[PDB]
A paper describes a structure:
Among the most-studied ion channel proteins is the [name] family of tetrameric, six-transmembrane-segment, voltage-gated potassium (Kv) channels. We present near-atomic-resolution cryo-EM structures of the mammalian voltage-gated potassium channel [name].2 in open, C-type inactivated, toxin-blocked and sodium-bound states at 3.2 Å, 2.5 Å, 3.2 Å, and 2.9Å. As observed in other [name] and Kv2 structures, the voltage-sensing domains (VSDs) contain the membrane-spanning S1–S4 helixes while the S5, S6, pore helix and selectivity filter P-loop form the ion-conduction pore in a domain-swapped configuration. The selectivity filter of potassium channels consists of an array of four copies of the extended loop (the P-loop) formed by a highly conserved sequence, in this case TTVGYGD.
We report here the structure of the corresponding [name] mutant in the [name].2 channel background, which shows a nearly identical dilation. While the corresponding mutation W434F in Shaker essentially abolishes ion current through the channel the [name].2s mutant allows currents to flow transiently on depolarization, but decay to less than 3% of the peak within 80 ms. Here we shall call the cryo-EM structure of [name].2s-[name] the “inactivated channel” structure, keeping in mind that other distinct inactivated channel conformations are likely to exist. When W17’ is mutated to phenylalanine, it is no longer an H-bond donor to D30’. The resulting destabilization of D30’ allows it to reorient toward the external water-filled vestibule. Y28’ normally participates in H-bonds with the pore-helix residues W18’ and S22’ (right-hand panels), but with the release of D30’, and presumably the entry of water molecules into the space surrounding the P-loop, the side chain of Y28’ also reorients toward the external solution, filling some of the original volume occupied by the side chain of D30’. The result is an enlargement of the ion-binding site IS2 to a width of 5.1Å between opposing carbonyl oxygens and an even wider (11 Å) cavity is formed at the level of IS1. As in the inactivated Shaker structure strong ion densities are seen in IS3 and IS4. We were able to build the atomic model unambiguously into the 2.5 Å map that was obtained with C4 symmetry imposed.
Numbering used by the authors:
A (entry chain B), B (entry chain C), C (entry chain D), D (entry chain A): 138 to 188, 207 to 275, 289 to 421
The structure:
Amino acid sequence: RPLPENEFQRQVWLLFEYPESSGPARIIAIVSVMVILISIVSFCLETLPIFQSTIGYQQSTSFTDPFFIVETLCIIWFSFEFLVRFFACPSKAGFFTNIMNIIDIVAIIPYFITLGTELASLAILRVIRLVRVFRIFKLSRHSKGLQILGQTLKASMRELGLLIFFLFIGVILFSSAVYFAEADERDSQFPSIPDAFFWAVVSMTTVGYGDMVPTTIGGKIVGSLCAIAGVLTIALPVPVIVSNFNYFYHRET
Amino acid sequence: RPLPENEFQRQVWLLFEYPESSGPARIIAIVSVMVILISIVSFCLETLPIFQSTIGYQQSTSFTDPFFIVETLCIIWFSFEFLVRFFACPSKAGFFTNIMNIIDIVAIIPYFITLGTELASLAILRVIRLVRVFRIFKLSRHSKGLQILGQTLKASMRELGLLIFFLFIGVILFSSAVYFAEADERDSQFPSIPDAFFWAVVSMTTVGYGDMVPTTIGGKIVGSLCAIAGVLTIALPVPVIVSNFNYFYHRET
Amino acid sequence: RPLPENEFQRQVWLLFEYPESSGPARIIAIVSVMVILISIVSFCLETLPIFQSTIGYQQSTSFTDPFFIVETLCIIWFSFEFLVRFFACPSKAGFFTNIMNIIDIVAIIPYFITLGTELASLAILRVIRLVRVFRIFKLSRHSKGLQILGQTLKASMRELGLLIFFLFIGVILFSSAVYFAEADERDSQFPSIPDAFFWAVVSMTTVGYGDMVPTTIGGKIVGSLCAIAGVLTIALPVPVIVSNFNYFYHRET
Amino acid sequence: RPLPENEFQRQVWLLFEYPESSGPARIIAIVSVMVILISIVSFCLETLPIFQSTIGYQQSTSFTDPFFIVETLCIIWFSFEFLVRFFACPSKAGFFTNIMNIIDIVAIIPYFITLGTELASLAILRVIRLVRVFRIFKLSRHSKGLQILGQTLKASMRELGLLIFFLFIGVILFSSAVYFAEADERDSQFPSIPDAFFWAVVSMTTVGYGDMVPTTIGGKIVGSLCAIAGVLTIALPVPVIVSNFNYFYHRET
Ligand SMILES: [K+]
Ligand SMILES: [K+]
């Protein structure tokens, strides 16, 4: 809020925090959005089967890999923006409390961990690589819809918990029912109850497991009941989430 | 809210009925939830072939089966809780009227029936085994969302009946239509009308039968009509159920 | 109120039209519902491949076919009920205006046409046979939910028309798009635009065509757009239909 | 609403713009709707493989192709109507501002471009042929529901943008999750992240990819989360679109 009053720190903060403050602020916001989108495209295209061996980018002095070059450019821009915001913040105590800044730090972390490891062990490497996808959330800084979605999810945590709990109850119940209904066959597509968990989830969400359906009569009755109960139970805590989203979406206007 | 008044039955009743009454009450509630979850996990993992022919656990003096040990421990805890609640209840006349106590009683019955059978014949044994899954509802004592769902279902029995009746009407109508539309084929995937019941249910719920679709033109028109009518008819009595759920869910605050 | 004044026609009319009038009226209503359900079960079970070739029942003096016996008994009961109601109606002018009597008449018509054909070419016979399924609507006389659904459909004719028209627009648009996107393939699952009509209907209703999906990139973009647009367009006129149903359903009590 | 006032231009404009003006206006409206439907049927049936090959019509002096004859008749009627409305318009300044006239012009363009090409080279041919499908929107002139849908879409552009943006976020996130969950397999159905985009779209819309499902446990957890999140995120900005549609639909009466 309050400018630093240095006549230069306040100007930089207002340029890098309020896109509507001036023309260069809008240009910088557009550039940041373009860089984020380019980083997303590079992250998606690194996994393409046509193109290191387990990290997606090979570090070299000459920077032979084009994907490494693009990732390095994006990380350099992100680090510049984050450092400049950190230096130009009026109150640096509350800088680390904002989620929109933790998203920014967590999007730069995987690059430096990989570089440090390579300069100086496979499951953790892939875990770090998966954290790279969390930089798509940096669009929340420039998208008000994404911020509204974040507020809705924060305000509807109990509702999400109830939805997951109800789905868990239904999944276990109908998995047990469909296992015990189709247990007396030699070609049972549900060998056990855990094997029927995903079928229960898919039937309840009405995604549909394709042609893999129960073969018995009791199995088909259980499948029909599962299809009904999924619609009946998912749609109970969803309307309150939609109401919260509408409240947070029309509050901006 | 009536205390036992014995100065000793009251202490046990308040500990085992009001988790918020003290610290040990909450510890006991957490322990009970953990035991219920462990029993659920054991029930699900008994059917896994990787880790006694129709029940999933062999009762023996040596207790060789770990699953038998886990089930016995869970049943002992459930029986302890139920017996202590039954003894410490202020009014024992209304104890058996509460659904939350019938759920607790019906979750201990399958273990003792199996024990009596083993101490002293196949389909009924599997039926009793299927009843074991009803102990997942013992979480309703510790989950307010589950109690709210129970109240919603109690208050919306007419609406569930209408939903099932409408689904039955649509299923029979569209099964007849799709059987008679594709009757003049040698490779008809719908040999009869009962064979087309599950396809009708799956199309109406928009679960989707995968690649199995009518091959004729009239069959495809009937399938399109079924897909439309399922959405059109399932979504009529569901909003009132959602309204009942919202009423029972916001009535707490 | 104004009684029929016959002193005998009124007694029969009140018995066969007002189930709440007395105990025998309730017994007759229960018997009629049971007979309707038995007729429905017989109609569904005639088509089973285990159990003449174009009518489902072979007419004989001895009545060898059990299905013919059941159909004859149900038709005799329906004709008795219809004739007694027609004779005992206070105003016979408005008897044929009620839809609940046209349903009753049209459920007896297929039986006598078949009897006349047997006693005294093929497509019309199967058309008449398909008309037999309309006797499931005779439950509307004894079910208030079915009458409420009928009133809702009468009051939402424009809304159903708009839903069908919007689906037609979307189906043609997306069928053209997915044919033109996947035209340049030798293994194209969409040889023409009419062949892509049902895929468009199924994608729009989110039923899902299984594993048959466009193989190109533009085809997959068109499929994603179809999946979005179906949800977005079916859900526009459905809420007004739901509102009409709620109005006709809460007005009952 | 002001007539041309020429006593002949006004008469033509009122005949060709207000169907309720007289009987001939209604006859002309019915004829125009029939011609539009005939053109749509011809466009759909041109692609049928039973019947040059990359343009949809072969030009000859004798007009051998029946489809060319039908398309030429439809285009002649459309051009006559458009020219007569352009000549009979009261104010030609606002003629090009109405969307219902731009739709009319674009639906006639592909025929004249193609004719000029043949009388006096592959991808843009597909583009032009795809543009032919826009003549289905000429029904908006005669259908009030289509105009209401157009108003709803114009008034809900931000909501559509949010829906597409949320879809893109979810698709990228869940495609990355399901690629990295099923990366350590030799039979991985998701070779890369772009190859898993359409699976994510189909799962989120609950269309269902048939029997193609993740084989790992983490893959199935990601699939279940995708199925939940699709329902949870598509249904947030859709209710506001439905509200806009209801506002534009009940405003007539
Ligand atoms: K589906
Ligand atoms: K679905």
